Structure formats: structure tokens, C-alpha cells
Amino acid sequence: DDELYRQSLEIISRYLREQATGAKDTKPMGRSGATSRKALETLRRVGDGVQRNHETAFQGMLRKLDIKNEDDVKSLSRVMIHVFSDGVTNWGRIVTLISFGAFVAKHLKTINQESCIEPLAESITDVLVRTKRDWLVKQRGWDGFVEFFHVEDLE
Numbered sequence: 001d002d003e004l005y006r007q008s009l010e011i012i013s014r015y016l017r018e019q020a021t022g023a024k025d026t027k028p029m030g031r032s033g034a035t036s037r038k039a040l041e042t043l044r045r046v047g048d049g050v051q052r053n054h055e056t057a058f059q060g061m062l063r064k065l066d067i068k069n070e071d072d073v074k075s076l077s078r079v080m081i082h083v084f085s086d087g088v089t090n091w092g093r094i095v096t097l098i099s100f101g102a103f104v105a106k107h108l109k110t111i112n113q114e115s116c117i118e119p120l121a122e123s124i125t126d127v128l129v130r131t132k133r134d135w136l137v138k139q140r141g142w143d144g145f146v147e148f149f150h151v152e153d154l155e
């Protein structure tokens with residue numbers, strides 16, 4: 001995970017940043033590269049799906065969390081660790097984790113707090129890897145992520 005954390009962080013960062021700014025992740029990924037780009041495209045189609053089907057839940061949880069500044073951001077990781085670390089692990093739960101990540105980043109930009117997007121990203125990444133590296137390793141990681149969701153809605 002001196003590379004699974006970094007690659008995970010690369011996907012999650014670029015995803016949250018493009019969801020927050022509406023600007024597309026140009027500039028290269030740096031290893032494994034294509035794996036990461038294709039994961040990001042997947043994350044767009046799948047993560048858009050999760051936000052559309054869960055808008056009421058997402059809106060309600062974002063409001064209950066009441067996020068105004070980065071000091072809130074440092075205390076979110078412990079709510080997020082608490083919620084995500086119990087129960088079965090599956091790719092659907094990981095994409096929900098990240099999608100609500102994006103949701104929060106869009107909020108952060110709306111209240112002019114873009115700066116917290118990076119810490120938020122890192123926090124998501126740490127929670128995911130800290131808690132699931134083994135699972136992620138034996139689902140063949142982000143290549144496993146690309147294939148399981150095999151985009152057959154865009155072709």
C-alpha cells in the first residue's frame with residue numbers, strides 16, 4: 001500500500017476534485033496510469049448512479065453532518081470509520097463511501113471551502129485502505145474495480 005494508498009488516493013482525489021469543480025481530470029496519472037484513468041471513468045458512471053438513486057439520503061446526511069470548515073473535516077473520518085467498518089464489504093459499499101465523498105466535496109466548494117477537498121480525499125483513502133487493504137488486494141484492486149463494474153452503459 002505504499003502504492004495502493006497512493007493509487008487509491010489518486011482516483012479518489014481526482015474524482016472528488018472534478019465533481020467539485022466540474023473540470024475534467026486532465027494531466028497524466030503516474031502509474032499504473034491506465035488502470036487509474038479507467039477506474040476514474042467507472043467511478044463517474046457508477047458514482048453518478050449512486051448519487052441519483054440516493055439523493056434524499058445524501059442530502060439528509062450532508063445536512064445532519066453540518067460541515068462548515070476543515071475542523072469538521074478532521075472529525076468526519078471517525079464517523080465515516082464507524083459507519084463503513086461494520087458489516088459486509090463489497091464494491092457497492094466502497095463506491096457509496098467515495099460517492100458521498102464527492103457529495104461532500106461539492107458542498108465544500110459551494111460554501112467556498114475547496115481547500116478541505118484534499119484532506120477529505122485523504123481521509124476517505126485512509127479509511128478505505130486502513131480498513132480493507134486485504135479485501136482490496138484479493139479482489140485484484142482497482143483493476144478488479146474496473147472489471148466488476150464493466151461499463152456496459154456507455155460501451
Ligand SMILES: Cc1cc(OCCCc2c(C(=O)NS(=O)(=O)c3ccc(C(=O)O)o3)[nH]c3c(-c4c(C)n[nH]c4C)c(Cl)ccc23)cc(C)c1Cl
Nearest residue numbers: 054057058061076079080083084090092093096097100101
Ligand atoms: C465521505 C463519507 C462517506 C461515508 O460513507 C459511509 C458508508 C457508506 C454509506 C452507506 C452504506 O455503506 N450503506 S450499505 O451498507 O446499506 C450499502 C451501500 C451499497 C451496498 C451494496 O451494494 O452492498 O450496501 N450508506 C450511506 C448513506 C445512506 C444511504 C445510501 N441511505 N441512507 C443513508 C444514511 C449515506 Cl446518506 C451516506 C453514506 C453511506 C460516510 C461519511 C460520514 C462520509 Cl463524511
